[PDB]
Paper text:
Salmonella typhimurium bacteriophage [name], a member of Podoviridae, is an established model system for studying protein assembly and conformational changes in macromolecular machines under different functional states. Approximately 250–300 copies of scaffolding protein gp8 and 415 copies of coat protein [name] bind to each other to form the procapsid in the T = 7 laevo icosahedral arrangement. In addition to the conserved HK97 fold, [name] has a distinctive nonconserved domain (insertion domain or I-domain) that is inserted in the A-domain. Here, we report the cryo-electron microscopy structures of procapsid, empty procapsid, empty mature capsid, and mature capsid of phage [name] at resolutions of 2.6 Å, 3.9 Å, 2.8 Å, and 3.0 Å, respectively.
Compared with the procapsid, the mature capsid expanded and became more angular, the sixfold opening closed, and the capsid became thinner. The structural changes of the capsid were caused by the conformational changes of [name]. The N-arm α-helix became a long loop that projected into the [name] subunit in the adjacent asymmetric unit. The tip of the F-loop transformed into an α-helix (residues 36–42). In the A-domain, one of the two short α-helices extended from residues 172–177 to 172–184 and the flexible loop (residues 190–208) became an α-helix and a fixed loop, resulting in the closure of the sixfold opening in the procapsid. The P-domain and E-loop tilted, resulting in a thinner capsid shell. The I-domain was largely unchanged, except for a minor shift of its D-loop. The salt bridges between E81 and K249, as well as those between D246 and R255 in the procapsid, and the hydrogen bond between W48 and T46 were disrupted due to the conformational change of [name]. New salt bridges were identified in the mature capsid as compensation. For example, E5, E15, and E159 formed salt bridges with K31, R42 and K216, respectively, in a neighboring [name] subunit in the mature capsid.
Author numbering:
A (entry chain A), B (entry chain B): 55 to 108
The structure:
Amino acid sequence: SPTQEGWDLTDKATGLLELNVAVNMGEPDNDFFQLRADDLRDETAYRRRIQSAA
Amino acid sequence: SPTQEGWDLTDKATGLLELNVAVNMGEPDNDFFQLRADDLRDETAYRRRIQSAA
């Protein structure tokens, strides 16, 4: 806000001003892999890949 | 007080003197603004301006 001195303030009132800032977003981050059915007989690699992705 | 030396001191009596300091005021300090009634449909800027003024 601005300010002002004195008693008589006639025709010296100010207006308001409020400023702003924008926030935006980018592109998603992915881990994306493919796996055949027979490769899921042993599930350690799949789970470890999930943890390392996190 | 003054201080004086000797025995006689005749015709050398002093007077009394007390000094003064004056405190006064200044001009009033103001935040003064104008708004049309259409600007008060959303009054958030008005309240935030009041806070800024304080």
